[PDB]
Each structure stands twice: as structure tokens, then as C-alpha cells.
Design an enzyme around this catalytic site. Structure first.
Site, short mmCIF file in Angstrom:
data_model
loop_
_atom_site.label_atom_id
_atom_site.label_comp_id
_atom_site.label_asym_id
_atom_site.label_seq_id
_atom_site.Cartn_x
_atom_site.Cartn_y
_atom_site.Cartn_z
N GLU A 145 -6.97 26.90 34.31
CA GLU A 145 -6.66 25.95 33.08
C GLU A 145 -7.83 25.92 32.35
O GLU A 145 -8.90 25.27 32.92
CB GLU A 145 -6.14 24.79 33.58
CG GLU A 145 -5.93 23.72 32.61
CD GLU A 145 -5.03 22.72 33.15
OE1 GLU A 145 -4.83 22.38 34.20
OE2 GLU A 145 -4.68 21.86 31.98
N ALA A 193 -1.95 21.97 23.13
CA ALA A 193 -0.99 20.74 23.12
C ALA A 193 0.25 20.80 24.32
O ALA A 193 0.72 19.60 24.64
CB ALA A 193 -0.36 20.77 21.64
N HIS A 227 -9.67 24.11 28.74
CA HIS A 227 -9.84 23.33 27.56
C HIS A 227 -11.12 23.40 27.06
O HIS A 227 -12.06 23.28 27.53
CB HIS A 227 -9.40 21.82 28.01
CG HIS A 227 -8.31 21.87 28.72
ND1 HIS A 227 -6.95 21.91 27.82
CD2 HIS A 227 -7.61 21.77 29.90
CE1 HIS A 227 -5.90 21.67 28.82
NE2 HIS A 227 -6.23 21.52 30.00
N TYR A 274 -16.82 21.39 12.71
CA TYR A 274 -15.84 21.61 13.58
C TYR A 274 -16.23 22.92 14.52
O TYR A 274 -16.01 22.71 15.74
CB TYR A 274 -14.45 21.75 13.13
CG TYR A 274 -14.07 20.39 12.65
CD1 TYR A 274 -13.41 19.47 13.58
CD2 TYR A 274 -13.77 19.99 11.28
CE1 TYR A 274 -12.96 18.23 13.26
CE2 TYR A 274 -13.34 18.73 10.94
CZ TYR A 274 -12.71 18.02 12.08
OH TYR A 274 -12.34 16.70 11.34
N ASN A 301 -5.02 28.34 28.47
CA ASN A 301 -5.36 27.31 27.61
C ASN A 301 -4.09 26.67 26.90
O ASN A 301 -3.71 27.21 25.79
CB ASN A 301 -6.52 27.40 26.49
CG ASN A 301 -6.96 26.28 25.81
OD1 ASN A 301 -6.21 25.29 26.00
ND2 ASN A 301 -7.82 26.43 24.99
N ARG A 310 -11.08 25.62 9.50
CA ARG A 310 -11.51 24.31 8.46
C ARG A 310 -12.68 23.81 8.79
O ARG A 310 -12.85 23.40 9.94
CB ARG A 310 -10.42 23.31 8.71
CG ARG A 310 -10.54 22.36 7.50
CD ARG A 310 -9.37 21.06 7.57
NE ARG A 310 -9.98 19.95 7.47
CZ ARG A 310 -10.38 19.01 8.35
NH1 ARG A 310 -10.20 19.24 9.55
NH2 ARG A 310 -11.21 17.89 7.75
N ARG A 356 -10.23 11.28 24.72
CA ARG A 356 -9.42 11.60 23.57
C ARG A 356 -8.42 10.39 23.87
O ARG A 356 -8.64 9.41 24.29
CB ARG A 356 -8.83 12.95 23.22
CG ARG A 356 -10.01 14.17 22.85
CD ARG A 356 -9.53 15.32 22.76
NE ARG A 356 -8.79 15.54 21.65
CZ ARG A 356 -8.11 16.44 21.19
NH1 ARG A 356 -8.14 17.66 22.05
NH2 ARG A 356 -7.35 16.67 20.08
N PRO A 376 -0.57 26.70 21.30
CA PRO A 376 -0.69 26.25 19.69
C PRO A 376 -1.84 26.07 19.21
O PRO A 376 -2.57 25.44 19.84
CB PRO A 376 0.59 25.25 19.94
CG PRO A 376 0.81 24.77 21.41
CD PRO A 376 0.28 25.92 21.94
N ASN A 377 -1.97 26.21 17.98
CA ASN A 377 -3.20 25.84 16.87
C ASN A 377 -4.32 26.37 17.32
O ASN A 377 -5.30 26.45 16.56
CB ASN A 377 -3.43 24.26 17.21
CG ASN A 377 -1.80 23.57 16.77
OD1 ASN A 377 -1.45 23.97 15.51
ND2 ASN A 377 -1.20 22.83 17.40
#
Lengths: 145, 145, 145, 145, 145, 145, 145, 145, 145, 145, 145, 145
Positions: free
Chosen positions: J100, J79, J102, J24, J76, J19, J109, J11-12
Site C-alpha cells: 500500500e 480516495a 500513499h 502542489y 495506491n 494544477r 489530514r 481515483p484523482n
């Protein structure tokens, strides 16, 4: 610069008013949504509402909010409060301020309910005031302006 | 049966607006209290306010509330949120419904701030909306009536 | 710009030297306070001392410190070390640098004593050196200037 | 019966003053050591200093201290604060009193830094006062005599 | 196929018998090592001993053990019991069976001492029997053969 | 501005390929180091490698890296991953970006292995890909340039 | 050598018998105090009682107890049971034996209530027997004599 | 002053050698007990053995040990290692020194097995050496004399 | 409706007065039981006492209590305080009110002793008053009637 | 036996580059996917990519992978890393090796991000290298062949 | 090869149906046992039942089961579910498959009840179905055959 | 009043029988569903089955169950057991009794699997009996009627 509110209702909120209207309560999500629309129309604001049992539907709505002109979100994640890192991360990514609303007192239930994936990035929190919490959320947005 | 609100402010809330009015904020507890009095007078309600750095002064005010005719409490325990079992137990003992108000987001600060001795017995919780939280608390009491 | 030190002693520090002067120690808070006054007068500084068993009295003293011209605080919170979020928040609010002093070794006692509500915002920490810790605190302020 | 101080500096303390003297600080371990030597010579004391990135070198120095006539240790274990049971046990075994010194505030950093293998057997603790902590340690030894 | 024992002593074990021979004990590591050599020579075995305050020296000795013909290790990691993943991993890598020996009762001291990086891969554990634990370790190896 | 890579191997990595080349693997640290040198020479980079069972040797190498012209570090702390605050603090102090490499899957072993003193300050992490992880680390540095 | 009992009641104990005398109970603190006075007078003892919502008032009473001739304390810290290190430390400092009394079963309520800052230094504990606990406390002091 | 050893075997130790003598082991409790009797008779000692699945039978045996002339206990609590506060308290009450023996490595099994109600009051601990642990226990008692 | 008290003593309470009558205490369980019988006979009550090292014997006694006419139980579970869910569940099942008695202060001993399987369902708790706790328990039952 | 890679984005990840492209990052998921396709086509491999905000869509893709001929997965979970036991169990069930990936450093974080439902069954882990992590994942698969 | 079921009932199960047959339930252990015997006889199986408040009686029954020809165990450990490592270890030692039965929902009671020393080695678990759970256990054994 | 069973299968249960039918098992969800339909038809009951990898599909099915006439639910949440507060809350909201079924022993796997969001509100739990658990669930519903 027109205030545009997205109201997001999480899973099971569609059931409000269904079972034992006497004991549990008679107010329906449809009644809440009609009342928020009026209160927003009264102020010259746009408002749209979405309820979903589906995490991805709520995440999509947040992702789409910026290009739709949304300025503020009012979110009741319901069960997803304790589980949905995806929705938290969608809110963080689009950086629209949101008020977290809970109908019930999440501190007076099962211990797991005390944890929110939202409370640390929320622009406000209103709990335990029933359906009035949503209208207070709109009041909170208004009172900033 | 007249609505009588006791507004209780915990330690350090007297300092609102003192240091760096630019960065931290210019609103003063006196300004908040004047505004709550007007909003309550507007509705035909009694309201009295008390701030104290002293736990026992807040506990005394709660203990005295019932015979004074208090119907609702609006409480910002500030630091006592995390420490004062005495004030929690005074609220439980007199059984007057209270709304817990925090100016700031307690979930976005030191980990110890996430624990409240009040949230499980509160009749509502409003956080992170600054001084507007108190007026929303009065709105919440009104919207029940 | 004159150095003005507030020395704050928490609960039970008034008892220094009372019971079993042989075993526990004969130095009194009055003796400590006289010695700090001399050492501060020697350097051309203002110093005032306050002990209290009352959290609110210590919080009031911190709140009042800025307008009194206090530049530095020397604080022995004693029992309040482990309990007083109110005093922590008063120190954070007035943003006067403080040195945390403990007579004893807090790491060599009950486990609960290892937690301080002060150590993460202190400008220095001196423990386990008895009453000499206060004079070292003044030495520390001096050695910065 | 002559006061003989061993000053022990743990890993990475040799880097003091190397990188970004503006932001981080310009004082060097060599400067600290020269200043402690003078302050000890001033008082008629012996003092020797040792820095090492090697745990075994610091442990050897403690083991050898008693036969060298060392009366007091001033120890900045730096990273070893959180890891070196060997150095703790060498200090316990030779039973020379030590003052634990930290340049920084260990309570205001990563959570793991709050644990010390030294604080429960130290004869004193001085933190957060930068390089002045070492001179205060010598002041503390002197003020006992 | 000749039994070859490596006896490894961790940090601070060189201090056995040094301080307060009355209270703490008079037996020296040299005395222990002489006794283990005799007991191993008696049985027709090779034995070599190494003590070090240095983790890397003990790790090197384990790494070298297989090509030296070592069949069994007797290890007193002392402080490293609680800290040395490097020595654990060297033992796992060379897969020589080891008996873990502690002079003292590690369960009757500071809580942190109850954790061993060795006990889950040891071929035996002997604690609280003082220096006799090492000779019992040799007895244990013998009694298997 | 020439890319200069320091490759640091922690304890026990010298044993690669020694015991049961069939079951455990036949690749040797010497083979890995030769391959990284070629891959770095191929790109016009400097590269030097150091393995040590000694924490202080790795810390010294990091401390010396800046004046040697090192731009990037590739680090396999092996056992020190879980123990060496000294090496973490040396990396933080010299502020050279490092990639953390593990041969194995540290998440699929003893629970204590899941904690790294490096992962929160690393500029990248590569695990579970065997010796290829080091070459991927060099690929990662290259792909940034 | 005359037995002199100080009975200390913590916050909210003044409310005994006020609200819903039917459900909660009709016995008042005044009734309890009169009964303890009689029972102590009956035995030829001095007894004085103090209730306070203020921690500092209870701490002052303990600090003053020794010079007043107090031999025994009966303490119901109520909410302060879980919070007041200051009162614990005042009791430890004056070293008068105290019996800890709770009206209710603290083990059958919120989890936080199970922790007492008093139980480890109390000379006895009586809980869950209502107001009779205080008279049993006096019985306990008598039965020792 | 004659050495009299009580050997206590906890639940399920009667099953030694019963199921799959090939895989699990062929040694029987009867064989162990005969061997300990011989080794004790050899030294001029009294020894008696008791196994029980019943906590109360083992507790009775400890309670009776002092008047029977028992000087030393060798205890394998087996499952009771993790559960029997009653047996721990019987050992503490009669204050006869005991050696705790485990056949297996309790650190290499389920996490709950790592906790012993005995290890902090034992006079020695021998684990992971199979049935030889009992004979080593007798060796340990002998080697003290 | 005649008051019939069952007094239940857990494991090791038979040892009261046996070892070092000077240091530990000279009162015997037989003396306690005779005194409780007299005090109960004095009041016109039935009382029977049972001590056992066996959990099942205490559970049987509770199971049988209702048909025997028992109205109240006085229970000192001793070691079983921390272990016996069976006895807790027998007490819950027969629903006879019980007072939990401990001779010692369970809060001032090993941490594991602070947990009781009884305190949350007890009708009262008396600790740290030695053998007098049992007579106070009878006083507590009487004072209810 | 042809290498067929499924690249799964959680997700995302569709929001990459949307943005504040300055602060970013400007790289888009479409750009990443085009680059992975080229790199896989370059090697003679099949590759397909799927992003979804929906857990069930990613689970379906894994369930279908084996019959589609997928040999390797690059995942990836974003969330879902911290939440999706369903996706973990789909990966375990089809037993296709996955790497995996990221973008960010999950160790630097919120604390909750340090837990992965994937890392213990992954065939490799690459984090903190931004979008380059995916290409390194393909490099890792290639370097095995 | 004939199916022989041992049904084991733990402490307090003898009380089924005794107190308040209306509220709690009227079914008796004797009724359950008669019904299981019939259902087993119906299928041509042997079945014997044993209830005990004594851990050792249940452990003995398990130890004896193999030589008695028992093929399957149905176990309701009741309170021992949370306490009896001895019974767990007897089940592991004889390696007869067992189904764990609980009358009640152990997840809906005190937190300590959620832990079972049996669930990780059980061949099946049936809870919350009252006495029917035992008959379902027999159904489960049958349905395998 | 006709018994209508909804059987709900969570994510990955569609894969039953797909991979390595020899090792893992050959029974398919289709086979299970056909067997439950027959067993329900046999008894004169309605039964419908739904499997989904999608949380929202299972939540919708629960929300719709009451108006469809569903009397009982049989639920295997599979991965959602540990994650889906939404499904828990849908079950609580419609208040249809459900039996929780797991094919495997969730207590014998990863630690995270031991937590169920369902077990505290389930009307029964059946685990570790493979596909037979579902038929036993129907048996359990029948045996109540």
C-alpha cells in the site's frame, strides 16, 4: 470570465417523478434541467447538467470541468453524499467552488445521512427545499455577482 | 392568508460589520434587515425582524408569532443553534415552517458546531452564503408560492 | 493604552458565603469584587465587575467592552462554562484576551464539568484556588506588563 | 512548618529557549529556576527544582519529598501530563498538595492533550501563561499563607 | 527444570507501609519479599524480587529472565498496568508465563484503572487480596506442580 | 550540510533473533545496525544507531541530535509508538525530519497498536517489511537527494 | 416549619392548551396552577408558582426560595432539563429538596431528551402522567408528612 | 463466628469434563466440589456448594446465606458475570464478602467478556488458573485468618 | 371494565427491611403489599401482587394478566430494569398500560443503572420516593379515572 | 516464477502535476509510470500500470492479475483507501501480496483518512514520501529477492 | 447418524396468534410446531420442540441435547437474543450446529435489537420471513444433506 | 402478476470456485445461476441473474426492474453490503421486496462487516448457508405464495 455552471446529479435522481407522482412528487430531472438551463441562459451564463449512477462519471466530469471553462458547480451527490471520498477529492483537486444541494432534509432521516463528505469544503449548502434548491443555488451564484 | 415573515437573529449577529470591516466583512445587521424588508414589501408581504442575545426574547417572539399572523420564520440561531432546546421546542409547539440560515459554513469550524437543535425540524437549510442566505430564504418562501 | 479589566462572574456566584459559611466558605462576591478593585486601583488600572445569572447580560457586557476601553477580561463563567456558546462567540468576536477562572477543581466533579466552551480560546486558565484565582488573574495580567 | 517547595519540570522543558529564540521564546529553564529560587528566598521559603526526561527520576523526587520536608509541589509534567500514572500515584501516595502548571494552552492543541492524569488530584491548575505560570504558582501558595 | 520465580514490583510499591501505617496498612515491600523468599525456599525453588519506579529496569529484568533460568514471573505492574506496552511486549517476547497481581481492586477505582496491558497475556490474575495476592500467586504456581 | 542519520530503536528491539530463530526470524539488531552503517558509509553519510528500553535515553538522543549535526532520524519506537508523548514532543521540539519504521504490520495486531504518537509528525512511514524497512528508510532519504 | 412549595415551570409550558386543544390537550398552565394552589391550601401549605421562558428568572426564584421560607420545590424544567447547568447549580446551592416533573415520556422522544441535568440531584421524579404529575408531586411531599 | 463458605457455580459449569476430556479438560464440577469440601473440612469450616443454570436459584442461595450462617462466598458467575444485575444486587444486599473466580482468562476472549457486574464489589478476583482458582479462593479466605 | 391492578416486584425486593432496619429502612414488601391492597379495596378495585427473583415468573404473570382481567400494571423491575428484554417484550405483547416504579434514584447510582428496558414503553415513571412510589402509582391510575 | 508487478493507481491520481505545478508539485502520473517501468525492466521484471477513477476497473484488474502472471501488486487506492471494501475483498480473494503506497501523510489530514480498508491485509505500507513511495515499493519487492 | 432436530423457542413466542389475530397475525406456536414435526417426519427425521420463558429451561435443553442424539438445533431466542450469554455458552459448549431464526426484522426495530449473542456462532441466520423462517431452517438442514 | 425474480450478485462473486477449489469451495456463480433458473422455471416463474463488480450496473438493474416486470429481488451485495448507499436508495425508490443473501457469516468476520446498508429495508435475510442461501431465498418467495 463568463459564468459556466456544471450541475451534477448523483445516483437515483433520474428516478424523480417516476413512482407514485401523487405521493412522492411529479417533477422530473428533465424538467429541473430545462428550468436551470433557461435560468442560466437568461443571465448570459453557460450551464451543462450531468446525472449518473456511476461515481467515476461524476469524478471525470469534475476533473474535466476546469479545461471546459466551468466557474461554479452545483452538486447533488444524493447517496454519494455519505460515501464518495473520490468525488470530494476531485472537487478539492480542481478547486472550483460548489454549492451542495439536497432535495430532502438529510437531518430528518436515518442517522447515517447526517454525515456529508462535501459540507466542510462546499461554498454553500441548500437542503430540504425540493427541486427549488437547484434554482436557489443559481440565485446564490448570481447574487455573489 | 397574507405572507408574514418573522426574521429572527440570534446572539452576536448585532456585531456584524463592527470589528475589522476589511478582513471580517462590512455588511451590518441593519443593512440586512433593510434589504429583507424591501424584498418582502416588493412581494406584498409583511416582514418583521428581531435580533436578541437573549434566548427568552427569541422564544417569546416565536410564541407570539401565530397570533401576530406570522406564516413563515427565517431563523439564524447563531450560537443557540448548538444549545437552545427551548427555541427548538417553541418552534415545534407553534408549528410555523422555518428556514434555518447560517452565514458561515458550520461544517468547517469546531466539531461541536456540526450539531443543530433545528436542522431536523427545519423546512429548509441555507448555510455558507453570508448575508445572501437570508434573501435566498425569502426567495425560497416565494418560489413555493 | 491604560489597562482596563472587566471581571465577569457567571450564575450562582452571587451566592458565595450565603449557606453554611463554616463548611462551604464565608468569602462573598462583594468581598472579592472590593479586593479586585483595590488591587487594580493600586496598579493604576480601571476595573469593573459584573455578576449575572443571565447569559445575555454577560454577552452584552462583552459586546460593549471594546468601546468602553476594556483591554483584559477575567471570566468565571460558572455553570455557563459547560453551556454558553453565545458567550464564547461574543469573546471570540471582540477578541479581547480573557483569563478563565474557576473557584473549584472542575476536573474533580461530575464528568460533564470537564468540558469548557472557553478553555481553547482563553489566554490563561486558573482553577481550584478558590477566590484567590481572581487576584492571581490580575497578577497574571500585571506580570505580562 | 517552614514552607519548602519542590518544583518539578517534565521532559523537554530543558529545551526552553534553545531553538528559534525569536519565534518560540528566549526564556530558559535556568532563568525560570533562578527566578523561582529568588521569589522563594524572598519569602523565607526553601525551594528546590528538578527537571528530568525520566519518569522514574520525577517519581523518586516525589517519593523522597516528605522526608526532605517538602510542604508544596509545583509540577509541570509536560508530555507526562497525558501518560504518567506512576507520577500521579506517587503524588497521591505522599499526599503533598501540588499545583499543576502548563506553559501552553493544552486545550488549544491535539485532542489527546486535553486529558491530564493530574488535574483531578491537583490543588490548583495554571495554564497558558508561559513561564509566568510557575511564579503565579508560588504566588498561589503564598496567598494561602 | 528447577522452578525459578522472578517477582517484579512496579512503581510506588516501595512506599508500602510508609504513610499512615494505621489507615493504609503497615506491611512493607521488604516484609512481602522476605515472606515470598521463605515460601519459595520451603518448596526448593529459586526466587528473586526486583522493585523499580523505572519501566526500563523492569523490562531489562524480563529480557534477562530466560538466560537466568526463570520459569515463572509474578508481576505487580502497579501504575504501569495501564501504561507500559514496553513491559507487555518484553513479557510476550520471552514467553515466560506470568501471574498478574494487584493489591487493590482495580475495578473499584478510577475508570482508567480497569484497562490492563497485561490481563490478556497473563497466565493468571489475582486482585484485591492485598499482599496475600503474591503468596497466592506462588500457591498457584505450586498447585500446577 | 553532510547527511547525518540517527537511527533510534525502541524497547525490545535488542531481542531480535534471540528466541526461536526458525519461527520468529534470525536477523539481529547488530546485523541491522552493521548493514545501515555500510549503506550510509557507501553514500558518504554519517550514521549512528542507539537502541534503548528507556524512554529518557531516546529522548536525550533526540535532544542532542541537532548539536551533533544530525540531519535525518530513522525511528522505530516499537512499544513507545503507542505511549511516548515525551519522544513525540522531543522530535517536534528539534524539528529534524524523521521516518517512522515498524518491522511488523501494526494494523494487523491488537487494536491499540493502530494508534501512533508519531505518524502525524513523521516525514514518512514504512511498515510491515521487516528489517528491510530501515534500509528502505535510508533509500527514502537518499532518493530525496 | 410550615410547608411552602415553589412550583417552577420552564419554557413553553405557558403554551399548554393553546394549539389544537382536541389533539394535543385542553388543560392550561393557569388551570394546573389553580389546582395546585387549592390542593396546597387544602393541606394548610403555602404554594407559589412561576413559569418563565428565561433561565435567569427560574435561577433567581431558586436563589430567593430559602429566605422566602420555601421547604420543597416542584420543578418542570421542560427544555432546560437537557441544557440548564445554571438551574441545576442553583438547586444544589440552596439544597431545597425538589421533585422533577415531566408531562411527557422523555424516554420515548429524541435521544437527547433522555439526559437530565436534574435527575441525579432530584428527591423524586414523576414523568409521563401529563398535568397529573404536578398533583402527584404534592401528594409525594404530603405522604412524606 | 465459625467460617461457613458458600461456593456458587453459574450456568454451564455442570458441563466441566463432559465433551472432549482430552482437549478441553477432564476435571468435573463434582471433583472440584469434593476437593473444596475436604479443604474446608480440613480447616474446621462449613462449606456448601450449589451450581445452577437458573439466575433465581443463585439469587435465592445468596438471599438465604446470612440466616444459614454463611461468612464468605466463592462465586463463579460464568455467563452471568456479564448479565446478572439481580445476583450483583443480592450480593450487595446481604453484604457477605465474596471472591469472584473464573476458570478461564476473560480478558483473552470476546470483548463483551471483559465486563463483570461483580468485579467492583468483589473482595477478591482470581482468574485464568482453571479449577485451582476455587482452592486458591479458600486459601485466600484462610490467609486472612 | 372494573379496575384490576397487577403489582409486580422484581428480584431482591423481598429483602426490604431485613438488614440494618435503622440505616437502610424498616418497611417490608409485605407491609407495602398490604397497604396497596387496602388502597385498591378502598377504591373498589381488584389488586394482586407478585414478587419473584425469577424473570420467567414475572413474564408468566404479564402473559396471564389479560385473561385474568388486569387493566393496569405497577412494575418495579428492580435489577431486571437494566437486563430483561423478555419482560419488556411481554409488556409490549399484552399492551396493558404499566407505571414503572423505582424506590431509589437510579440516576444517582452506577452509570449502568441509568438505562431502563421499560421507560420508553411505560405509561408513567415514579422514582426516588421509596415505598410511597407504589401508592403514588395507584393515585396516578385513580387520577386518570 | 518471473516477477510481474501490477501498479494500481486510484481515483484523482491522473491529476498529479495539473494544477499549480509550483505549490502542489510538477511530477505527473505518466512520469511516475515511465520511471517504474524502467526500474522494473532494469531488474528483468514485467510491470504494468493502471489508473482508474472507477472502483470496478481496479477490481477487474486485481481479479485478472493471477491468470496474467502477476506476482506482486503496488497499490495506491487514493480516495478508495477509506471506502472500497470491493477492492479489499478482490485483493483478499486472489491472495497476491500488495504494498500500500500513499503520496501524502494520511495521519496528518482529516480524521476519516486515518482508516484504511487495506492496511490490515497489506504486505507493506509506505506513506508520506511522495512519488518516491512507488519506487521504494519496487525496492521493497526486490530486497525480498 | 439419524437427523434429530431440536427446535427451541424463546420467551413470548407462546403468545403468537393471541392478541389482534387480524393486525399482528393468526399463526400459533402450536401450528408452527405441528408443521415442523410433519416436515421432519416427512424426511425420516426426529424433531422435538420446546418453548420457554425461562432461560434455564432452554439452557438445560441444549445441555441434554447431545445425549438425546440431537444433530441440529433451530433456535429462535426471541428476547434472549440480546441478553442470554448463558444460552450462547451452552450452545458453544455442546457444539451442535444451530440455525438462528427471527420472525421479524431485528434490524428495523429498536437499536438494541441489532446485537445478537448468537449470530457469530450460528451455522446460519434466517430473519424477517415470519413463521416460514423455521421451515426454511429445516429446508437448510435438508439441503446440506 | 407472474412472479419475476431478479437475482443480483455483487463484486467478487464471479470468483466463486476459482482459487483453491479444495479449501474455499468448488461451486461457481454459473452453477448457482443455472440452479436458480431451473428452480424458478420449475415454478413457472421468470428469473434473471446479473453479477457486477460495478455499483452503477447493479443500481441500473434495480432502476429498470419495475418496467421489466420484476416482482421480487434476491440480492447478495457482497462488499457493497457495507458501502453502497446508492444501491440501498435504488431499492427503496422502486419498492420491490428483496431478500438479502450472504454466503458467509458476516457476524463472524471483521467488525465492519456487521453493518449492512440493506438489512433494515430487506423483506428477509439469509446468511451463512453458502450458495444454498439463494435457493432458500426462492423457497422463501414461493412459501409466501
Amino acid at each position: 470570465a463568463q459564468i459556466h455552471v456544471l450541475v451534477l446529479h448523483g445516483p437515483n435522481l433520474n428516478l424523480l417523478g417516476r413512482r407514485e407522482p401523487d405521493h412522492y412528487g411529479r417533477t422530473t430531472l428533465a424538467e429541473i434541467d430545462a428550468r436551470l438551463k433557461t435560468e442560466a441562459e437568461g443571465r448570459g451564463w453557460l450551464l451543462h447538467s450531468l446525472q449518473s449512477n456511476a461515481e467515476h462519471i461524476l469524478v471525470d466530469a469534475v476533473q474535466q470541468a476546469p479545461t471546459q471553462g466551468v466557474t461554479h458547480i452545483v452538486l447533488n451527490p444524493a447517496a454519494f453524499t455519505h460515501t464518495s471520498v473520490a468525488l470530494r477529492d476531485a472537487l478539492a483537486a480542481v478547486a472550483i467552488p460548489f454549492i451542495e444541494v439536497h432535495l430532502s432534509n438529510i437531518h430528518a432521516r436515518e442517522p447515517f445521512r447526517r454525515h456529508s463528505y462535501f459540507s466542510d469544503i462546499a461554498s454553500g449548502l441548500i437542503t430540504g427545499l425540493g427541486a427549488e434548491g437547484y434554482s436557489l443555488a443559481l440565485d446564490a451564484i448570481a447574487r455573489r455577482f
